[PDB]
Scaffold this active site. Structure first.
Site, PDB file in Angstrom:
ATOM      1  N   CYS B 108       0.840  -1.196   0.000  1.00 32.16           N
ATOM      2  CA  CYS B 108       0.000   0.000   0.000  1.00 32.16           C
ATOM      3  C   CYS B 108       0.873   1.244   0.000  1.00 32.16           C
ATOM      4  CB  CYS B 108      -0.958   0.025   1.208  1.00 32.16           C
ATOM      5  SG  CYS B 108      -2.019   1.491   1.242  1.00 32.16           S
ATOM      6  N   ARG B 111      -0.017   4.483   2.840  1.00 28.13           N
ATOM      7  CA  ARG B 111       0.029   4.177   4.260  1.00 28.13           C
ATOM      8  C   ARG B 111       0.378   5.359   5.148  1.00 28.13           C
ATOM      9  NH1 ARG B 111       3.989  -0.608   4.939  1.00 28.13           N
ATOM     10  NH2 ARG B 111       4.434  -0.282   2.714  1.00 28.13           N
ATOM     11  N   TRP B 280      -9.142   6.819  -0.647  1.00 28.59           N
ATOM     12  CA  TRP B 280      -9.404   7.589  -1.850  1.00 28.59           C
ATOM     13  C   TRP B 280      -8.406   7.172  -2.941  1.00 28.59           C
ATOM     14  CZ3 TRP B 280      -8.232  10.130   2.809  1.00 28.59           C
ATOM     15  CH2 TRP B 280      -6.889  10.496   2.954  1.00 28.59           C
ATOM     16  N   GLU B 285      -4.857   4.390 -10.650  1.00 28.55           N
ATOM     17  CA  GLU B 285      -5.733   3.234 -10.468  1.00 28.55           C
ATOM     18  C   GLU B 285      -6.890   3.243 -11.461  1.00 28.55           C
ATOM     19  OE1 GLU B 285      -6.338   1.919  -6.325  1.00 28.55           O
ATOM     20  OE2 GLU B 285      -5.763   3.990  -5.823  1.00 28.55           O
TER      21      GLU B 285
HETATM   22  C1  HEM Z   1      -6.248   6.599   1.758  1.00 32.31           C
HETATM   23  C2  HEM Z   1      -5.660   6.506   0.568  1.00 32.31           C
HETATM   24  C3  HEM Z   1      -5.147   5.183  -0.043  1.00 32.31           C
HETATM   25  C4  HEM Z   1      -4.470   5.119  -1.196  1.00 32.31           C
HETATM   26  C5  HEM Z   1      -4.087   6.320  -2.091  1.00 32.31           C
HETATM   27  C6  HEM Z   1      -4.150   3.722  -1.453  1.00 32.31           C
HETATM   28  C7  HEM Z   1      -3.466   3.239  -2.550  1.00 32.31           C
HETATM   29  C8  HEM Z   1      -3.227   1.913  -2.817  1.00 32.31           C
HETATM   30  C9  HEM Z   1      -2.800   1.353  -4.083  1.00 32.31           C
HETATM   31  C10 HEM Z   1      -2.559   2.136  -5.386  1.00 32.31           C
HETATM   32  C11 HEM Z   1      -2.649   0.033  -3.925  1.00 32.31           C
HETATM   33  C12 HEM Z   1      -2.209  -0.916  -5.066  1.00 32.31           C
HETATM   34  C13 HEM Z   1      -3.310  -1.917  -5.398  1.00 32.31           C
HETATM   35  C14 HEM Z   1      -3.598  -1.956  -6.882  1.00 32.31           C
HETATM   36  O1  HEM Z   1      -3.086  -1.069  -7.619  1.00 32.31           O
HETATM   37  O2  HEM Z   1      -4.350  -2.869  -7.325  1.00 32.31           O
HETATM   38  C15 HEM Z   1      -2.989  -0.304  -2.532  1.00 32.31           C
HETATM   39  C16 HEM Z   1      -2.964  -1.548  -1.907  1.00 32.31           C
HETATM   40  C17 HEM Z   1      -3.457  -1.855  -0.654  1.00 32.31           C
HETATM   41  N1  HEM Z   1      -4.044  -0.938   0.219  1.00 32.31           N
HETATM   42 FE1  HEM Z   1      -4.000   1.071   0.089  1.00 32.31          FE
HETATM   43  N2  HEM Z   1      -4.648   2.951  -0.407  1.00 32.31           N
HETATM   44  C18 HEM Z   1      -5.280   3.822   0.478  1.00 32.31           C
HETATM   45  C19 HEM Z   1      -5.942   3.461   1.631  1.00 32.31           C
HETATM   46  C20 HEM Z   1      -5.993   2.221   2.211  1.00 32.31           C
HETATM   47  C21 HEM Z   1      -6.739   1.839   3.416  1.00 32.31           C
HETATM   48  C22 HEM Z   1      -7.648   2.785   4.232  1.00 32.31           C
HETATM   49  C23 HEM Z   1      -6.493   0.546   3.620  1.00 32.31           C
HETATM   50  C24 HEM Z   1      -6.965  -0.369   4.759  1.00 32.31           C
HETATM   51  C25 HEM Z   1      -7.329   0.133   5.958  1.00 32.31           C
HETATM   52  C26 HEM Z   1      -5.577   0.100   2.584  1.00 32.31           C
HETATM   53  C27 HEM Z   1      -5.057  -1.160   2.463  1.00 32.31           C
HETATM   54  C28 HEM Z   1      -4.423  -1.649   1.360  1.00 32.31           C
HETATM   55  C29 HEM Z   1      -4.056  -3.032   1.210  1.00 32.31           C
HETATM   56  C30 HEM Z   1      -4.276  -4.198   2.222  1.00 32.31           C
HETATM   57  C31 HEM Z   1      -3.466  -3.157   0.021  1.00 32.31           C
HETATM   58  C32 HEM Z   1      -2.939  -4.532  -0.441  1.00 32.31           C
HETATM   59  C33 HEM Z   1      -3.561  -4.893  -1.763  1.00 32.31           C
HETATM   60  C34 HEM Z   1      -3.207  -6.305  -2.138  1.00 32.31           C
HETATM   61  O3  HEM Z   1      -2.351  -6.998  -1.490  1.00 32.31           O
HETATM   62  O4  HEM Z   1      -3.824  -6.713  -3.151  1.00 32.31           O
HETATM   63  N3  HEM Z   1      -5.310   1.134   1.751  1.00 32.31           N
HETATM   64  N4  HEM Z   1      -3.321   0.884  -1.907  1.00 32.31           N
HETATM   65  C1  LIG Z   2      -8.510   1.059   0.178  1.00 34.93           C
HETATM   66  C2  LIG Z   2      -8.084   1.363  -1.239  1.00 34.93           C
HETATM   67  C3  LIG Z   2      -7.569   2.602  -1.594  1.00 34.93           C
HETATM   68  C4  LIG Z   2      -7.194   2.843  -2.921  1.00 34.93           C
HETATM   69  N1  LIG Z   2      -6.691   4.044  -3.285  1.00 34.93           N
HETATM   70  N2  LIG Z   2      -7.335   1.885  -3.857  1.00 34.93           N
HETATM   71  C5  LIG Z   2      -7.830   0.670  -3.539  1.00 34.93           C
HETATM   72  C6  LIG Z   2      -7.999  -0.381  -4.614  1.00 34.93           C
HETATM   73  C7  LIG Z   2      -6.723  -1.176  -4.778  1.00 34.93           C
HETATM   74  C8  LIG Z   2      -6.880  -2.562  -4.210  1.00 34.93           C
HETATM   75  C9  LIG Z   2      -6.548  -2.780  -2.878  1.00 34.93           C
HETATM   76  C10 LIG Z   2      -6.684  -4.061  -2.328  1.00 34.93           C
HETATM   77  F1  LIG Z   2      -6.379  -4.285  -1.030  1.00 34.93           F
HETATM   78  C11 LIG Z   2      -7.139  -5.117  -3.123  1.00 34.93           C
HETATM   79  C12 LIG Z   2      -7.461  -4.885  -4.460  1.00 34.93           C
HETATM   80  C13 LIG Z   2      -7.943  -6.031  -5.325  1.00 34.93           C
HETATM   81  C14 LIG Z   2      -6.838  -6.458  -6.294  1.00 34.93           C
HETATM   82  C15 LIG Z   2      -6.546  -7.948  -6.131  1.00 34.93           C
HETATM   83  N3  LIG Z   2      -5.614  -8.450  -7.151  1.00 34.93           N
HETATM   84  C16 LIG Z   2      -4.978  -9.676  -6.638  1.00 34.93           C
HETATM   85  C17 LIG Z   2      -6.345  -8.739  -8.397  1.00 34.93           C
HETATM   86  C18 LIG Z   2      -7.330  -3.613  -5.004  1.00 34.93           C
HETATM   87  F2  LIG Z   2      -7.659  -3.410  -6.297  1.00 34.93           F
HETATM   88  C19 LIG Z   2      -8.214   0.398  -2.226  1.00 34.93           C
END
Ligand code: HEM
Ligand SMILES: Cc1cc(N)nc(CCc2cc(F)cc(CCCN(C)C)c2F)c1
Ligand code: HEM
Ligand SMILES: Cc1cc(N)nc(CCc2cc(F)cc(CCCN(C)C)c2F)c1
Ligand SMILES: C[C@H](O)[C@H](O)[C@H]1CNc2nc(N)[nH]c(=O)c2N1
Ligand SMILES: C[C@H](O)[C@H](O)[C@H]1CNc2nc(N)[nH]c(=O)c2N1
Ligand SMILES: [Zn+2]
Lengths: 407, 411
Positions: B108, B111, B280, B285
């Site tokens: 993420c 964070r 947000w 994305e």
């Molecule tokens: C607040 C602004 C946030 C932004 C800009 C953001 C951005 C992102 C982005 C770009 C990814 C890459 C996933 C993808 O591209 O498919 C990601 C992954 C992730 N985010 Fe954040 N996120 C935000 C908030 C949060 C919050 C509030 C949580 C949980 C409380 C969170 C938990 C995660 C997790 C667990 C992943 C792992 C995704 C995975 O393993 O597939 N995010 N985030």
């Molecule tokens: C909280 C949040 C913020 C943000 N700015 N954007 C996202 C969407 C990105 C994302 C976060 C996530 F935790 C899991 C998936 C599913 C993808 C699973 N792949 C294995 C296909 C996501 F797309 C989530």
């Protein structure tokens, strides 16, 4: 143990079993992945020779043949007596082509089997080294129809008699620091540009001054040589649409030629083995021109395009970055110099992966390096899972000589 | 043991001791790196050590390690486990757990915001309708009329894995995808499988290109039920370009609130199988992946056409050109409607600052380079040049199999 890799854009799944022939270590553990870290005697030598010779003779379908066991015996004998050994030319060529085949960070490996190997193991002097490197350059350049090549200098013996090319590439622009502030020319080469002047070079103090070769034979002091300018093909960079582009005064050289790596074959270490091919467009335009610790011309290009540079959200850096890279490709293509764009090269690599899984059982690959530094997800390698593991023969990094030379 | 990461653009070097508190495996060995692989019912036996580790961490953060409150909580949790085979988290512990699960999310980039999470305790929920209500209030609160706030809603933990709460949607808000008999796809190709499930479960599909999917909600292991989010709660942004007037005519829009709902939250050995969370968007994305992936809306072609680009050879970089304008348009629309969004330059810079701060105050910050680097213009963002260590800390968000593959249907 017979691992699968999924492509997420196409759902194609490949089974990797080549990895079980991995040997060297990755730097990772089950507790920590280091996949993004830049750089993690008689008894040891014979197993290394055996492993190499066993796979060499398998590739020519003479595994367990008379000629196989005889060579194994012969090399075994030579090791027992000489504490090293010499590669038959055929083994040298196979070892070199396969070190490239195994370069898990190289996106251009679909070409791996067409490498031109130049055996320079009879070389004794820096003047000799210079002669070989000029021949390498002219053959590789080929009037802009580039051809892959490697030139292999004598193998390490006691580490006191090493052959080294001190330049990181055969052809690079110099880096001069300014009395008033930043840096003129190429900042990555600033220290080497010192060690040139500080070893006797007379710098033109321009922005695109080709650096001189600094060649070390048999562990002696290295010597400066100027590559004949008629051997250094260069491309002036213009845009197919912006006629103010030429006024930035940009040019780059046609021949990427990595000179500071170490080539390992059957346990033997070739500390001087400059190799070369042809550029992917983004290496120049994305990295050489736009990295902050490099030529960092973005600020000026965007001004010339009159883009809103006040907020990052206008994506003006991105817009400029695309133009700069359109121009690089446009220029090389115009002057008939080989170059490949990142869409074509990554697609080629997918094809190449297909073939390596199909005819070899896998293909070691480092996603952090295969994925181009712009437009990553619109290239097919982005959605391609890759397995990274170290096969041998291989290219490996080695300390910079100036830190090492018993001067 | 100490470990060093270097930033090759600025030569800043950082020392990670936090990787020493690492448990779950990476998938890697000394002979293979799986760093680019997408995917790498629990007894009293292994549970109390997991609880104790979590409670130890919890009480260290509140500077009460070894306190009487700490020791009594261990004893209480211990006896509750042997007595009931599980245990319940206090409110304070649940809040800490969810924040730290985000903090530990090594993929993420957002964070830096981790300590500002709004935690909604939905552990008193019991039915799908009750789930619908909790999720509606999550969406309303997080949306906040465009001024987005991060939130997570935590439904009851798993017990015997036969009574799971699950949100069957991958995201609370997502557009339908319809496979046509001619082979083309109307709507979002990512959501075709889920759309069919919904249609089969009884959804009356409007069969448009941007239809908001119904929530499909499973409580206490019962069959899932369909619910329509009230449209006035779904904030959407029509996508236009600040220089290209023809862009609006592409008919594109996107929803404002990214809210992931298919992941599993692990805290002290407890498993929260339904825990939707939201933040947000980073502009890429939507603009790079949602629109321009070949297996998504794939508007690159028609944007390239209308821009009049040399589409014949790829070395015109017409794809790269179209991609940038589409991402300019996404950022422009969201800012114009005052819906919270962050561009990838802003977000990567914030992450680097967050990351350094985490090394200084915490001894490390696990990060997955493959995921942190934006999917366009990678090297002109500072995370590209940042070496990063990846390892797994708990609390954590884990993946879990889609429930329609494991669920046992009642009827
Ligand atoms: C607040 C602004 C946030 C932004 C800009 C953001 C951005 C992102 C982005 C770009 C990814 C890459 C996933 C993808 O591209 O498919 C990601 C992954 C992730 N985010 Fe954040 N996120 C935000 C908030 C949060 C919050 C509030 C949580 C949980 C409380 C969170 C938990 C995660 C997790 C667990 C992943 C792992 C995704 C995975 O393993 O597939 N995010 N985030
Ligand atoms: C909280 C949040 C913020 C943000 N700015 N954007 C996202 C969407 C990105 C994302 C976060 C996530 F935790 C899991 C998936 C599913 C993808 C699973 N792949 C294995 C296909 C996501 F797309 C989530
Ligand atoms: C012919 C066309 C070639 C192309 C298009 C190409 C492309 C690339 C690119 C883009 C990189 C990433 C490095 C960076 O961005 O700085 C790379 C690395 C590399 N290339 Fe290739 N290359 C080519 C030929 C060759 C040849 C002929 C050899 C050797 C015989 C070779 C060996 C390597 C090695 C060993 C690396 C990685 C070294 C490391 O670990 O850092 N390449 N290549
Ligand atoms: C043969 C070749 C072809 C090509 N098309 N391009 C290159 C240059 C890319 C490259 C290849 C390589 F093997 C080593 C380095 C040194 C940089 C290492 N890092 C520490 C920055 C490189 F730049 C080389
Ligand atoms: C194969 C590869 O791991 C896969 O395409 C990953 C790569 N990195 C990613 N990074 C982000 N932010 N989002 C993704 O979906 C992916 N996909
Ligand atoms: C920190 C990270 O390891 C470093 O920036 C790497 C990332 N990927 C790269 N990829 C290529 N092709 N070339 C590079 O120099 C790098 N540098
Ligand atoms: Zn790894």
């Amino acid at each position: 143990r017979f691992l699968k890799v999924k492509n997420w854009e196409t759902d194609v799944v490949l089974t990797d079993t080549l990895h079980l022939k991995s040997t060297l270590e990755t730097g990772c553990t089950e507790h920590i992945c280091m996949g993004s870290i830049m750089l993690p005697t008689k008894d040891q030598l014979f197993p290394l020779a055996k492993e190499f010779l066993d796979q060499y003779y398998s590739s020519i379908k003479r595994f367990g043949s008379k000629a196989h066991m005889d060579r194994l015996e012969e090399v075994n004998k030579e090791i027992e007596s000489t504490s090293t050994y010499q590669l038959k030319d055929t083994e040298l060529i196979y070892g070199a082509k396969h070190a490239w085949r195994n370069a898990s960070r190289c996106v251009g490996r679909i070409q791996w089997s067409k490498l031109q190997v130049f055996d320079a193991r009879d070389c004794t002097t820096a003047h000799g080294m210079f002669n070989y490197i000029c021949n390498h350059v002219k053959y590789a350049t080929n009037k802009g129809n580039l051809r892959s090549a490697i030139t292999i200098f004598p193998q390490r013996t006691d580490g006191k008699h090493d052959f080294r090319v001190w330049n990181s590439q055969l052809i690079r622009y110099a880096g001069y620091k300014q009395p008033d502030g930043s840096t003129l020319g190429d900042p990555a080469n600033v220290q080497f540009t010192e060690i040139c002047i500080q070893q006797g070079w007379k710098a033109p103090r321009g922005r695109f001054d080709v650096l001189p070769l600094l060649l070390q034979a048999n562990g002696n002091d290295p010597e400066l040589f100027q590559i004949p300018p008629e051997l250094v093909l260069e491309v002036p960079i213009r845009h197919p649409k912006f006629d103010w582009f030429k006024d930035l005064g940009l040019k780059w050289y046609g021949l990427p030629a990595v000179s500071n790596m170490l080539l390992e074959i059957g346990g033997l270490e070739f500390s001087a083995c400059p190799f070369s091919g042809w550029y992917m467009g983004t290496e120049i335009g994305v990295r050489d021109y736009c990295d902050n610790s490099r030529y960092n011309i973005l600020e000026e290009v965007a001004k010339k395009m009159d883009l809103d540079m006040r907020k990052t959200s206008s994506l003006w850096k991105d817009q400029a970055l695309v133009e700069i890279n359109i121009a690089v490709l446009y220029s090389f293509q115009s002057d008939k110099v080989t170059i490949v764009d990142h869409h074509s090269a990554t697609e080629s690599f997918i094809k190449h992966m297909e073939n390596e899984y199909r005819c070899r059982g896998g293909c070691p690959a480092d996603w952090v390096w295969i994925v181009p530094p712009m437009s990553g997800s619109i290239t097919p390698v982005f959605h391609q899972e890759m397995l990274n593991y170290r096969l041998t023969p291989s290219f490996e990094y080695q300390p910079d000589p100036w830190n090492t030379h018993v001067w």
